[PDB]
Amino acid sequence: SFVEMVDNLRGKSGQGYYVEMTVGSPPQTLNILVDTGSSNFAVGAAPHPFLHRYYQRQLSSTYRDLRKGVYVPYTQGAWAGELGTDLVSIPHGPNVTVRANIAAITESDKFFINGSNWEGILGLAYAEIARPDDSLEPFFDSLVKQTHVPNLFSLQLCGASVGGSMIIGGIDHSLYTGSLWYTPIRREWYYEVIIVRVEINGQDLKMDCKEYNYDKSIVDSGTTNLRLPKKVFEAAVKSIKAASSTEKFPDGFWLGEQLVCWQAGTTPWNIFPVISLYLMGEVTNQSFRITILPQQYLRPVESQDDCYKFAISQSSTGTVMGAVIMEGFYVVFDRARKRIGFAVSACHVHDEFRTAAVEGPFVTLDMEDCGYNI
Amino acid sequence: XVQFLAX
Fold it and tell me: Which position among A56, A96, A265, A312 has the lowest Cβ density within 10 Å, counted as fewest Cβ atoms?
C-alpha cells in the first residue's frame, strides 16, 4: 500500500540522504536532508555559493513570519535564520499538507556542501532538543497532530549515487527480509537506545556496557559514521586490526586521516571482520544483535582505483549509530510504541559470502544499568 | 562526511 513512497530518497555517498519537500504557495520544492539526530526543519532561504535554489518567503502567500531568530549548532557546522510557518507537503510521502514551523536559513558555517544537491534539513527527533526551545513543534509532531498519519516512520538507506525509502505512517514489507527486532527508545529527545554488548567477528570486546553508552547512544541518519566513545573506539580499532592482520594498514587509516585504494573490483572485503552491536530488547533480560559488514564501515571516496575511508570514528558525545549502521538495515522509528525496529535491508550492500544480519534473542542480564544518568 | 546536533 506504501508503494508510492518507495525510492523517495536520494543522495551522494557520505553526504546524507534527502527527500523532496514542497513548501509554501505557489509550490516551492526543495531537497531536504533527513536527520533523525536533530529536531529542526530548516531550509536555505538566501543565496549561498553551494545552493542552486532556496526558499523565497516573499513569494509564498501562506508564509507567516514568527518574528524570532533561530540558531542551530551541529557537530562541525551551524546556521542562523528566521522562524516562520508555511504549508508543507512531501510529494512522494503521505497524501497530506500541514502547516509546519520552518527555519529560513540566511547565514551558515560549514553546513551546506558543495554539490550535494540538498538545500535544507528535516530534524525528525523530539521537541526536547529543538531550538530555540522545546516549544517549537518539530515537523513530525505537526504531521501527527494535524492529520490521520500514524505516529511512525521507517528508513531504508541504500548505500553505494545512493537512494532509499522513507515510509511515513507505516512499514513496507518489500524493504526488508527476516524478522523485525525492536529496542526501546530510552527517552524521547534524540532517538536514544542502549547498547549492551559489542563483538568483532564474533569476539566480545569485553568492555563494561556503561562505556558503550557514555554519555548516550543514538540513532542518527544525519551522521555518516559509526562514532564511538574514545575508550570504546580505541578497543574496537585494536580488535579490528587483529582480525584483519593478514593485511597491514597505516595507523592513520584507522584514524580516517589516510585512505587506502584498491584496483577497481579487487577490494578484499573478506579480510575485514563483521561488527555486531547487541541492543536491549523488549522483554526483560532479552537482547538481539545487529551485524554489519566492511561494505558498511569502509566507505568509497569518489578512475581505475577504488579508494576507501574507515568510517568508524571517535566521539566525545556518546555512540552515534549513523549511516554506517543504518545502511545495513530497514529501521523502523515506531514513535507510537516508543521503540526502534531493525531488520535486514533488502537493499544493503553485501557479497556472495556474507550478509548483514539481525539475530536474536540472546540472554543479557542487568541491561538497565548500561544507561548513563546525570 | 556529514555530521548532523551539538550535544
Answer: A265
**Beta carbon pairs, A and B, within 8 Å:** 46
Could you give the CA distance from residue A337 to residue A180 in angstroms, rounded to a whole number? 14
Asked if A98 and A187 sit in the same domain, the reply is no
Closest CA to A328 of A311, A345, A307, A310: A345
Q: Could you tell me which residues come within 8 angstroms of residue A238 by beta carbon, excluding any fewer than 6 positions away?
A: none
How close A360 comes to chain B (CA, Å)? 31
Inside any domain, residue A11: no
Same domain, A137 and A159: no
The domain that holds A205 is classified in CATH as 2.40.70.10
Residue positions counted in chain B: 7
Tell me, yes or no, whether A169 and A254 share the same domain: yes
DSSP string, A98-161: EEEEEEEEEEEES-S-TT----EEEE-S-GGG-SS-TTS--HHHHHHHHSS--S-EEEEEE---
Among A124, A149, A174, which residue terminates a domain?
A: A149
Domain that holds residue A299: 150-374
Q: Could you tell me if A163 and A77 lie in one domain?
A: no
Q: Report the residue from B4, B6, B7 with minimal CB separation from A16.
A: B4
Contact between A180 and A343 (Cβ < 8 Å): yes
**Which residues of B fall within a CB distance of 8 Å from A39?**
5
List the determination method. Answer: X-ray
For β-strands A357-363 and A305-310, DSSP reports them as unpaired
3-state class (DSSP) for residue A31: strand
Q: For residue A234, is it within any domain?
A: yes
Q: Domain count of chain A?
A: 2
* Chain B CB contacts of A222 below 8 Å: 2-4
Last residue of a domain, one of A122, A149, A176: A149
Substitution target in A40, A192, A220 with the highest count of B β-carbons within 10 Å is A220
| Cell numbers for A168 | 511515513
